[PDB]
Structure formats: C-alpha cells, structure tokens
Amino acid sequence: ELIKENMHMKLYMEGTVNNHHFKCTSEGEGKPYEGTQTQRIKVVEGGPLPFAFDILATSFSKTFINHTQGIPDFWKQSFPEGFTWERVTTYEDGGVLTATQDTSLQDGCLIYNVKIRGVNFPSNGPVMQKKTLGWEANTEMMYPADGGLEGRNYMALKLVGGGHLICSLKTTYRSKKPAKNLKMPGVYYVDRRLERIKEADKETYVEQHEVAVARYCDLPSKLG
Amino acid sequence: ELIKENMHMKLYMEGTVNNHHFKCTSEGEGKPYEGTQTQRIKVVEGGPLPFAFDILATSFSKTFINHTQGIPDFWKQSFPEGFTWERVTTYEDGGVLTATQDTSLQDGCLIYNVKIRGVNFPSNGPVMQKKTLGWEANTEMMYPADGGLEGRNYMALKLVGGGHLICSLKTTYRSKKPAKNLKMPGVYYVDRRLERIKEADKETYVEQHEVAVARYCDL
Ligand SMILES: [Cl-]
Ligand SMILES: [Cl-]
Ligand SMILES: [Cl-]
DSSP states (O other): OOSOSSEEEEEEEEEEETTEEEEEEEEEEEETTTTEEEEEEEEEESOSOSSOGGGGGGGOOGGGOEEOTTOOOTTGGGTTTOEEEEEEEEETTSOEEEEEEEEEEETTEEEEEEEEEEEOOOTTSTTTTTOEEEEOOEEEEEEEETTEEEEEEEEEEEETTSOEEEEEEEEEEEESSOGGGSOOOOSEEEEEEEEEEEEETTTTEEEEEEEEEEEOOOSOOSOO | OOSOSSEEEEEEEEEEETTEEEEEEEEEEEETTTTEEEEEEEEEESOSOSSOGGGGGGGOOTTSOEEOTTOOOTTGGGTTTOEEEEEEEEETTSOEEEEEEEEEEETTEEEEEEEEEEEOOOTTSTTTTTOEEEEOOEEEEEEEETTEEEEEEEEEEEETTSOEEEEEEEEEEEESSOTTTSOOOOSEEEEEEEEEEEEETTTTEEEEEEEEEEEOOOO
C-alpha cells in the first residue's frame, strides 16, 4: 500500500520565537500501524536556541498513530495527496506559539514542512531560561468538524525543581483528499507519550520518540 | 471508614445564567471506591430553565472517583472536614460559567452546596436555544499546584445536527484539612463519562449518572 509497515520521514522547520530566528531539519522512521516513530533532529540555523526545545517538540507526525477498534484513520486515508495542520498553543504564563505544517508523500518518503511563530514568552520564564524537563504523557480528544478534524488538549511541561507549566492546544487538521474519498471518524481519543532517546550540545541535536494509540473511551456505558 | 462502600449525597444549588435565576436540589447515592454515582435532580425555583441543562451537569462530586494504581486520594483523605472546589468554564462562543462548591460530611451523608454564575451566553446560541445533547466522555488532567490541586480539560458538548460546542474547564480543589496530614499525588488523569439517564417536564427533573476512574497514562 501507500503507507507501508515501515516508513521514513524528512522534516524542514523554520520559525521565530520572540525575536530569535531558527531552522531545524530532521530525518527518521517509524511503524505507522504500531504507532511508534523516531526522529533525529538538528538545529541547523540560529543555534543554540535561547529557548527550551520542548516548545517545538509537538511540532515535529500524525500518520504514525495506531488506530484501534473501529476508528477510521483520517491521516493514512489522506494519501497520496496528504494533509495539513495548524495549531495555536497558549501557555498560562504568557507565550503563544503558532505552528503550521504540510505533510506530503514523494518517493515513498513522508515530507514535513513546518513554520513556527512564538511570541510573548517571558524573558525570565522557564522557557526562555531553558528550565524545562519534558512533557507529561497525555490524551488528545479528536472530533470531526466540517469534514476536517479538530483536536483540543491541555499539556503539562515539567520544570526544573518540580511543578509544571500548563498550556492549551487548539488544532485543526485538513485532508487534501476530496471528502467523498475518505471515511470520517466519529469522536475518539489518542493516548501519546513523547520522550527523548538522546540529546546533545544544548539541545542542538535531539532524538525524539513517540508512541501513540487511537481508541474509544475505555469506561462502561449505561446507554451505548 | 468515614467514607463507606455506599454513600448517599444531598445537594443544594443556586445560580443565575444570563440573568435567569434558579435553584436546584438533588439526592443520590453511589460507590465511592468503584467510581460510580447517580443523582436525581429537581429544579425547585425558576423552572423550566430557559438554557440547556447540560451547562450545569459538571457542577452536580469528586469523592466518587475510583483511584487505581498508586494514586493517593485527595478527596476521600480530606474528610471529615471535607473540601471546596471552584471552577471557570469558558465556552468557545463567549459563555462563561463560574462555580463555587462546598463539600462537607454530616451524619454519614455527603452534603454539597453549589453556587453558579453564567454570563455572555449568545442569545441565539445552542445553550440559550437548548440545542444540546450531552457531553462526550473526557479526561481531566490533575496536578499538584497552588494551595491544593488543580484540574484542566476541554469538554465537547454535542449539538443537534452533529456538531460540538467546546469549552475549557479550569478548576482548583482546596482541602479544608491541614496539608501535612494528607499524601499528595503527582500528575494523573481522571477518565469520566457523564450520562443523562432521564429528564421530565422540560428538564425540571433530571437523572444523571457518572463513572470516573483515576489512572496514569496507559501506554
Ligand atoms: Cl453570582
Ligand atoms: Cl439570552
Ligand atoms: Cl484536555
């Protein structure tokens, strides 16, 4: 098929956070039907970043979600034409980051192009002081809206010395495939874990791993 | 012990939404350790309500959460003194609902006192026109913060014709008991399913059920 049991990926990312311009590239591979993937990420311009790499981490891959039970796979069905997404992440202490992404397929390779615009991260806050320690595992609630798919979620970013910085994520995913050709899912949930394999040189190189599984609610229902 | 295998609850609620005052009472029972409960609710003043009953649903019970794996129980451990919660619910179309709750324990019964204020619900929106069909199941993120425990989540309200109206919930849970007494949990999640069971007389009488389970992320 188009989405093989092993797929490779290449990513290009450009952006500004506050007033610092940067570029990253990455390459990796994963098991799209097992919901696992790895990316080796390099900061190739504007490094070392003067802000926590953590704020970029969710911007680096929806094709690699294991859809269990019923669920029609919005992202795998979108090929060969692919899909796009746009996200606004709003941090409770100030910081707002917009990310927009294009996912396409060429030569059997997934290609990601990402743009990033973050502003108002406080100068003395943990993001700009690089005092963060990764994301807590979480659950994204997915729901169909106008033939597209919407995601809503709160995430918690670990801080040096304990405690957390909280942010809200508001995401829209759009297929480039004509709506008549894809089966739309109902409401469902994606459990995911974002972790690092290795990092070096002040997060100038980061190897990042994700596990993700799409499911219905585990709880029993009195109506159905 | 002081929170038994079966527990009855009584509730008193007062509020105003878009300038429409109302009062509700309820009674119910559940199994705190199994994370299940039912309430039978009556609108005793200002009924029938001119807004969707659904916007009130989350204001009617944290003692009835099944704590699995390791997780220390902030709520059960807070008795006999009980606890408070306070919440802002912000709807993506402009409605804001603030609630303040007191949970106490008296003669073996759980007693809830709730006060609610709702403003800015669009006059021709789904809430004021009663076009809503209940809440999707959802997961609340729980973490230690402030003077107690905080909760965050988004909830999705089903609308007639197949859409959803989204709102965010921001909650602070404060114990009335000395913080040195209770064991404080790390970051965890509460899967909930809140289900309407019955309504009668234009939602003047409503029966509501909840299933709730505390867990870490299960990958
Ligand atoms: Cl008031
Ligand atoms: Cl009105
Ligand atoms: Cl959420």
